Every structure is written in C-alpha cells, then in structure tokens.
Design a protein around this nucleic acid. Structure first.
Ligand SMILES: Nc1ccn([C@H]2C[C@H](O)[C@@H](COP(=O)(O)NP(=O)(O)OP(=O)(O)O)O2)c(=O)n1
Ligand SMILES: [Mg+2]
Ligand SMILES: [Mg+2]
Ligand code: NA
Ligand code: NA
Length: 326
DNA sequence: CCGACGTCGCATCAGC
DNA sequence: GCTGATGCGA
DNA sequence: GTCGG
C-alpha cells in the first residue's frame, strides 16, 4: 500500500464513471491507472513522476498533484455530496442492480436499503437474492474458509462422477489470503470441443451441492455457467457462516488451459493480456487462442498444451498465477 | 490530434 | 416461439 | 481518460 491514497481515489473515480456517468472507457482508464500505480514500487512524490507510467496521462497526473498537496480531491468531494450520484452509487452495490436499474430506481424514489426492502416486488430474481444477502456479499472470505469450501466442492463433485475435475480459480488460485467469492472451473471427459456425450453435466453437480445444502440460492444457470450462493455448514451452538457467492464454469476438457487462464484472472490482467494478443495478431477467449488474418477475422484454434503455450504465442514471458493480480 | 481500447454466458425484453 | 439487442456480471 | 500511428 505504498500509494494507497492515490489508488483508492482513482478506484472511486472509476466507480463513479461506471455507475453514474455510465462511461465504461473512463472506468477502464481509471482502473488501468490505478493498477499500474499499485505495482509501482516507489512512494509517488508528484503527478509528474506518475505521468511517466503508461495509463497515467495529464488529467490523472493533475489529480495526483492535488491529492498529494491536500489529501483530498475536490471533484470527489462534490460527488460524495451529490444526492443522485450517492444514491446510484449505493444501489449498484446490490448484485443484479447495474447503472441503468439504479438510475431507474432513483427516478421512482427507491434509493435506500429500506426502500429496496419494502419494494421487493420491483426486483428481478437476481436482484432479490442480492438484496437478501447484501450484508454477506460485502464480507471477504478468509483463505482458511476457502479451503473448507474447496474440500466440500471437490468431494461432492467426486461423489457424482469420479471423472469430473473441479479446479478453484479466481483470486484463490492466485494465492490470495482472502477472496471476494469462490470460482470453480469444471471439466468432464464427456464434454469436449467436439461433442457433448452426456447432458446435464453442470446440472448434476449443482443438484448434488444443493442436496447437501452447500448451494443455497441460484442467481443464474445455463448449460455451462452457474452463478449462485453457498454456505459452509456450522457446528452446534455456533453462529452461521455468511452466505457466499459462487460461480461454476463448465469448460470443454480439451480446452482447459484457455479456460483456467481466463478464470484465474485477474480481470484487468485478462483485459491487458487479450489486448496484447490483438497487437500481436491473435485473439484469446476462455476456449481458444486464434490468429487474425489481414482480414481481421479469427482463423483456426492454435494448439495449446499448457498456460505457458498461450503466453508463448503472444511473446510474453510466463507469469505464475500469483503474479497475475493486476 | 483520432480511433480504437477483451471476450463471452445468462436473464430479460422488444419486435415479429 | 424465434431473433437480436440490452443489461449485468465473470 | 490515455495514447500510437
Ligand atoms: N470483467 C471480468 C471479470 C472477471 N474475469 C475473469 C478472471 C477473474 O479472476 C474471473 C473470476 O471473477 P471474480 O470472482 O469477479 N474476480 P476474482 O476471483 O479474481 O477476485 P475476487 O472474486 O476475490 O474479488 O473473472 C474477467 O475475465 N473479466
Ligand atoms: Mg472470485
Ligand atoms: Mg466470481
Ligand atoms: Na503516462
Ligand atoms: Na450491482
């Protein structure tokens, strides 16, 4: 946290632009600047020093000057005092409520936690669950609890079919001492890029985890992606664990390396890596890495036998998961 | 300066 | 019901 | 908001 004050300011600006201004490219701009500054190993002394870094331009340099001199940013101080901005910024903290819905709710005079709770019939299913567990979803998950959760998921998955492989990804795989949620990558030999020899492969696992009361709620669910809620079991006379977000992603087994690269993140790392790929004449998704012809159309999937192979194509030196937390 | 600036899954809706 | 666009999130 | 061509 060498430059915590600065990165916090930039993150709050990013959130404002995303949630209120609905300007995704400014949100992206601020987050890149925040990220490059976060990994800068010097305590920043000026906006000039910061401007040297890629992603930090004139405007953010000027803000860093103001922040260093005063400890505040007038632009943010005003935003914090704005009723519409503050309301919209709050409502978007509910999972399922984005920038559009938040502004619509404010229009209708729904703008506090209390208002949401007395207007549950105006929320869609995802939003209703997000409201239910608003408190819990704000809390972080200790790695110790993540390990307990991993143990349950892997063992229950094994009970269904021993040929499943479940891999916890996200911040957990990057070695984080705490995580915002649990991300699970799932493969099974019956589901490949070439065919699906067994239906309900994701559904069966979800079902089993519901059966043992680990999964408690469902935000969304399709053939390959589950977004939901889970909870560790507690002992006698013990206060219950908080409910936690869990995502499960079924990926073609022959496409594991692209899938695990994607689901390990970070999100900024993926954006930066996929951007670099384009510059080098490739495109990367959770399934494949493909070349781009002079056309601009993706060609055929290139051979991949490790995460490192993907780095090799775009001429990046390999980076272990723990070094991908951008 | 100016056009690009990651990529996709699921839920929901408008139009037909 | 289908198609395609939009919102939201990973 | 930043910046490579
Ligand atoms: N916009 C996004 C968001 C996430 N992702 C990919 C990699 C992320 O690590 C995988 C899981 O998303 P996530 O759970 O929201 N973030 P992550 O697990 O890294 O951190 P926390 O869950 O601890 O907050 O998202 C992405 O590629 N683009
Ligand atoms: Mg996560
Ligand atoms: Mg997640
Ligand atoms: Na710069
Ligand atoms: Na939200």
């Amino acid at each position: 946290t060498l430059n915590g004050g600065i990165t916090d300011m930039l993150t709050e600006l990013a959130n404002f632009e995303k949630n209120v201004s609905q300007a995704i490219h400014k949100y992206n701009a601020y987050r890149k600047a925040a990220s490059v500054i976060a990994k800068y190993p010097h305590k920043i002394k000026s906006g000039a020093e910061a401007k040297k870094l890629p992603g930090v331009g004139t405007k953010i340099a000027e803000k860093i000057d103001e922040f260093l001199a005063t400890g505040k940013l007038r632009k943010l101080e005003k935003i914090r005092q704005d009723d519409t901005s503050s309301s919209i910024n709050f409502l978007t903290r509910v999972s399922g409520i984005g920038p559009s819905a938040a502004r619509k709710f404010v229009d209708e005079g729904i703008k506090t936690l209390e208002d949401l709770r007395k207007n549950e019939d105006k929320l869609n299913h995802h939003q209703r669950i997000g409201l239910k567990y608003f408190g819990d979803f704000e809390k972080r998950i200790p790695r110790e609890e993540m390990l307990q959760m991993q143990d349950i998921v892997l063992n229950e998955v094994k009970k269904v079919d021993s040929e499943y492989i479940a891999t916890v990804c996200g911040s957990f795989r990057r070695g984080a001492e705490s995580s915002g949620d649990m991300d699970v990558l799932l493969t099974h030999p019956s589901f490949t890029s070439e065919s699906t020899k067994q239906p309900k492969l994701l559904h069966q696992v979800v079902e089993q985890l519901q059966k043992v009361h680990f999964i408690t709620d469902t935000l969304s669910k399709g053939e390959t992606k589950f977004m939901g809620v889970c909870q560790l079991p507690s002992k006698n006379d013990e206060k219950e664990y908080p409910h936690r977000r869990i995502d499960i992603r079924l990926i073609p087994k022959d496409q594991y390396y692209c899938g695990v690269l994607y689901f390990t993140g970070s999100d900024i790392f993926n954006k930066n890596m996929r951007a670099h790929a384009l510059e080098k004449g490739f495109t990367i998704n959770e399934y494949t890495i493909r070349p781009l012809g002079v056309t601009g159309v993706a060609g055929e999937p290139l051979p991949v036998d490790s995460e490192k192979d993907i780095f090799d194509y775009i001429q990046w030196k390999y980076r272990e998961p723990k070094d991908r937390s951008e």
